[model samples]
Target chain A: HHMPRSVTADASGSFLTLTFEDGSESRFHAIWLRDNALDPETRSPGNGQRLITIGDIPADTRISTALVDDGALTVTFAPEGKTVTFPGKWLKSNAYDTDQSSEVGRTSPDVETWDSSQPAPAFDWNEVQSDPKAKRDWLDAIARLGFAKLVNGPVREGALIECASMFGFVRETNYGKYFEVRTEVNPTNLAYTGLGLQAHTDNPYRDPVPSLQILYCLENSAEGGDSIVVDGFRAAERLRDEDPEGFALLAGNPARFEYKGSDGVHLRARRPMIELSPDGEMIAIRFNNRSSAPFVDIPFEKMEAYYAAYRRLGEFIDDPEMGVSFKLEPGESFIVDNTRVLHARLGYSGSGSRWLQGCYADKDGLFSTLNVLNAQLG
Target chain B: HHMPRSVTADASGSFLTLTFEDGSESRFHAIWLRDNALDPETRSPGNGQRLITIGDIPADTRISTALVDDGALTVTFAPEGKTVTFPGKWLKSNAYDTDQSSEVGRTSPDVETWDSSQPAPAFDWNEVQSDPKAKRDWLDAIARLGFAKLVNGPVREGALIECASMFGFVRETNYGKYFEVRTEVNPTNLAYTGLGLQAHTDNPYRDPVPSLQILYCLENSAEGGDSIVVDGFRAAERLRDEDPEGFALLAGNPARFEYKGSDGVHLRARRPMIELSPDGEMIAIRFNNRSSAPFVDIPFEKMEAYYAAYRRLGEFIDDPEMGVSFKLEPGESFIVDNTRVLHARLGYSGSGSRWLQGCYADKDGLFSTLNVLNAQLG
Candidate 1:
């Protein structure tokens, strides 16, 4: 583990320079350090949200001293005369300095690509709920593979929300916090009816599309209502390898998506199907046939090529080689990173009951928990 | 106004130091300065979007020489011998220095609060469409006041899109390329019927709510249907003044919003009515009664108080003193910063037609145009 060799304040008291045993040095800005104080008064104990405003800190607040003691790095502020401590390992992991080159698009070092041949990341729900280590490992799996399953959960009406609270808060949508996935009379969405869904990332029409989704099965006696999840990032990587021109075209052009179901609900968004950062590293994949609007962003000359790429990408997503399929028994649930995983449902028969509860969440919360777990466990 | 007194390079060849005539100095990182090059090749002339990525610049690129001539500061890069010139004044205005303090959730210094007594900022449609300066001024008004109007435009079906292109690109939603605010046989939204609307920001249910909206009027032969706009920031300020506790409650709690009127569209989001940054400066206001979901975030003990605050804020928005009302003519349109302004319409009768085409946009595009205009015009 990395530990500090020396901690020294700047001559003007504007920043602190820390030298680590690994010969790496980084300057921490006073205000940046102040705002990121992890004290209970500065941050929420429950969800880690900030509790203080910039105005709470004096304008001249500076580092009085910084020292490493007993595996912890403590920073004392002047004038206000306050002190906060951080883990030595945490500081090293998050260090930003001149030695770090500025790169626009970089993938998370932990993220791993996989195909259908790979076994789905699965965990026993009881173990994950009871053991912090088990929970942390499950979350780590989702972070890397973008999908995971929790087997043998409580088969109750609102069990999905319970499953979500184990990792993060449920992100309620127009589906009323947690929507029932059973068939309904005059169902507003096709998911409510006995229909097979094309593989898709939910709510592509929504800006900042829900980063995570959970579906918990309450009763699944229905025939052929199997859950299917496709690794969108893996499919995108395949497309890039097979057809670079097609990948580039889809990645460059913005595609429109929209949805209008019930009364007074019309939502739309325009984003590239293969989203890339400015430096062209893949970040997300948004492919939804049911929600897609007209492709007005591509030029008239390139429309045909864009359509071809879009069609081929869809084919890759649909291929059995890309999808991991499973039937959810009562008391089972699954979660997916909505940005990188495309989920679908197999059509069910009329005689049996199929009830599931679904909800959305954000990725930042999951990532935060993962980072903390890594810091503590390592 | 400022000129370089001395230019020097760092030992690592990764940064440059420039001393101004005023004796103040700042370090410019090679990558930071390179990414912000304002040349036509680095940025788009039409929309101001970046044309080059970090990868486009060489890894070992460095500042070989810096010279000031004819009120422009030109920097020549090594190896490539490529030169990019920036106006001395522009450099001074955008200089990044260590002395500058970090602040959060700041409104632009140009913004000015106003009520109904202040006249609506209006511009000649033709001038705004043809002259860059005219469009710049019009956009600046929207930035400062949160609303502006353009008069004497072409009253065609798609003319609204042209008006949007003057400053930003149109953001199409599930409502299609653009939505028509005319009555239908079975209207999906209350907006399509002859009904009054409460002053509110549009699409609060969207996670990243559309930041701008343009509504172009093609016909207005109705008895009523006068458009009204209220400054949400101004209303928030008033709430803070009158009831600090109420203001704090609304700002602290993340209220739920939803829309499920469409056949397949069920969108939802959770945001505070008065959103504040971590440092607590106001950033956005999401207060749409029609689209609001049940108040689940607030605890039972505070639910009544939340409702009271919500009701009072609506009253503040509806107060004639805080509103600027105007009836759009056949060839007139208005644009509002959807994050800051709440718009409403008076109920109309059955006798006459009132047709308007509305579209969404984003704040980044508007700010991009404003920045480019400031550069060119100054």
Candidate 2:
């Protein structure tokens, strides 16, 4: 019912432009239709993916005949001598000729950016384990807001790996499957020093930085060292609004990141600090100061402006009004999308102990798990 | 000494052009030089990374005075009056104002593309573990050719994890840290059939597919299942040379890949089959026909040509001359860069038992280990 009322084909039977009674139009090419709307037999029964590659399709293939029959669009292709009847609803939704949003830095509708006013999206550990609805909501919040917290988890060490299993598998680095972050010795750079770490992503030096990070508090007897989370996406948007030029500077150029760890580990990567899709969609934010390398890949004149832009972004990240802070108990854990949320710890002195275990994971797993849960639960 | 003879500064003192005695020239920017060449005091002792971010640099900072003192380029910046002398040898290599390669498919110097002529760069397992120089060469071969093999290794179950530990950590996925591949059930999509599988990089549906894949043979009772590897980079090069239009089509367009797994797993991603850096350096090649989704992202007219181009690239990938094949024995393993190599298994009909365990790891760790080894061993 959502399809057009009439269909007309071009002279060569290669293009089709359909028109509805409401005067709306949808134009589709022969190759596009054939490649996209394959017959059920051509697709796998195990999954919805097509069994054939583009190489299987004939080079000279074109529409031998095209028509709308019984609220379905039927097309026969030459050379292949195959016919596929595409449902009207599917055809209507699959139309690609419509105008699209070209706005830069626009995020997907599911993403919900937040500032300091928003509280941590915390969920009860028992409910998450027992109730399907509770688990769905918790995963949904993390997928949307890029941050979530779980209270009353097991306080034992290496518990972060188990926490990661709630949605995805753990991504191991040179630091092992999981690493401890208690007031520790200086083995792997400045993380152990009792200095306030600038809000940063874990490893910007990775080509694909770990998508998700889980930090489970084993002990928080320290006087200071409150955990803080800043929505990098929200801060990026603020930069886009207030200083568009600076925002563009960071997004348009690549920045180098490197880490020289102990025990024969030297990691390095180069990517834009503020990443965007081909169509200008804001996709990732890699903002780490500690391991950041110098900016010399850029040309001569842009250097000064780039530093200015970098300073402005850093100031925005340091703004108190941009962070969501909370002191975790022994059994509390928080996970952030390391690619989108900047996390930090307040410097502490005279601390009894501040022990935390953390692990990394991929968002592809999290989002895939979420999709399956949505379909099965719905 | 590879040092510049003279340096001239612009009136504003923000620009410097150095004259090399080899009848060459190098241009450097004030900001570029300052950011790259830092004082020893300003760097961390644990690692070579700078102790400050770009935010710490002054906005209006410019060169107040410039001179080459004692074979070093020394400049005092204006606002901070922070003077740092950059070594002429360092300045000679740090110059960014030079002609860079603009070739669309050009690979780095370390990457050595090969056809069937090249043999598997294999190393003795004992040497890799016991001899420091042996491991460096093994790592070097992998870092250069996108693949390497190990012979006379321990033949046991779960051996691939240990194989990965030689260079990096094992990346755990939904399939666990390592998975057994043999005559198996059809729980997964289509990898379990008697038919020959086309060459493909593993985990194409992941945004960041596991960079390296290691397969260790435990039992080889099958008559068939000869392992085949095609340098996707080399095949892509053929496509570029023969059908330049097709190469442009794939590089310019994005392709979708989706995987629907048993036990509730759905993974999907979109990337170009022939990935290139911003400046047209050939970076990654993601070619997997089995997991590819439909093509509808391009415009109308290009769709027909797009399929033709896809077919050409696929043909190049399937060309027999491009593939290197070898049947594995017990205690043998091979690791390939999943981002650049396309691996396959020849069909086996009558088989007693063919068992192989495979695991995934990150290239960042591998390269890091290799870099350290290069420094220490060299």
TM-score of each: 0.46, 0.91
TM-score of chain A of each: 0.75, 0.93
DockQ, each predicted model: 0.02, 0.48
- Per-residue lDDT of candidate 2, residues A133-228 (tens digit): 888899999999999999988777777777788788888887778887865565475566666778898899987689999988887787888989
Per-candidate alpha-carbon RMSD to the true structure: 20.3, 3.3
TM-score of 1: 0.46
For model 1 the local lDDT of residue B160 reads 83
- Candidate 1 achieves a global lDDT of 0.73
User: For model 1, how does the per-residue alpha-carbon lDDT over A1-378 read when each residue is reduced to its tens digit?
Assistant: 467788888887767888878887766766556656778988666544445543456767778888878766799888778899977777766554444322222344567877789878789989988887998899989988899999978867888877876655554444567788988876666677787888889878765567789988888887889999998888887788788889888886677776555533445666888865332445688877656654544554455466667767877888898999999989988999998899999999967799988888666556655655665678
In the range B1-378, model 2's lDDT, one tens digit per residue, is: 366677788888777777776767777766666666567656666656566656676666677888766677778887888888877777766566666556777887779999999998889999998987999999989889999889999988887787788888777888888898876423242345556667889988997788999998988876667888999899888888888888888887677788886668889886778876545567788888778875545555566676777778888887788888888999999999999998998776554677888888989888888888888887
Query: Model 2, which residues run further than 4 Å from truth?
Result: A1-4, A18-24, A37-40, A69-71, A92-94, A221-223, A238-249, B4-9, B17-25, B184-196, B242-245, B347-353
Q: Which sections of candidate 1 miss by over 4 Å?
A: A1-20, A23-91, A98-106, A183-187, A221-223, A240-245, A276-283, A350-353, A364-378, B1-378
Instruction: Give fnat of each prediction, in order.
Output: 0.01, 0.47
Q: Per-residue lDDT for A84 in model 1? A: 93
CAPRI-style quality class for the chain A–B interface of candidate 1: incorrect
Across B1-378, the per-residue lDDT of candidate 1 in tens digits comes to 377666777766566776778887756656556656777776544323344433346657777877667767678777667789877666666565444222323343567877899788899988986788998899999989999999988889988878776655565455655898874322343354466667889988765577889998987766666789999988988888888889888886667665654233445666789875332456688887556554444543454466567767877887878888887998899999999899987666445667788988766556656766776777
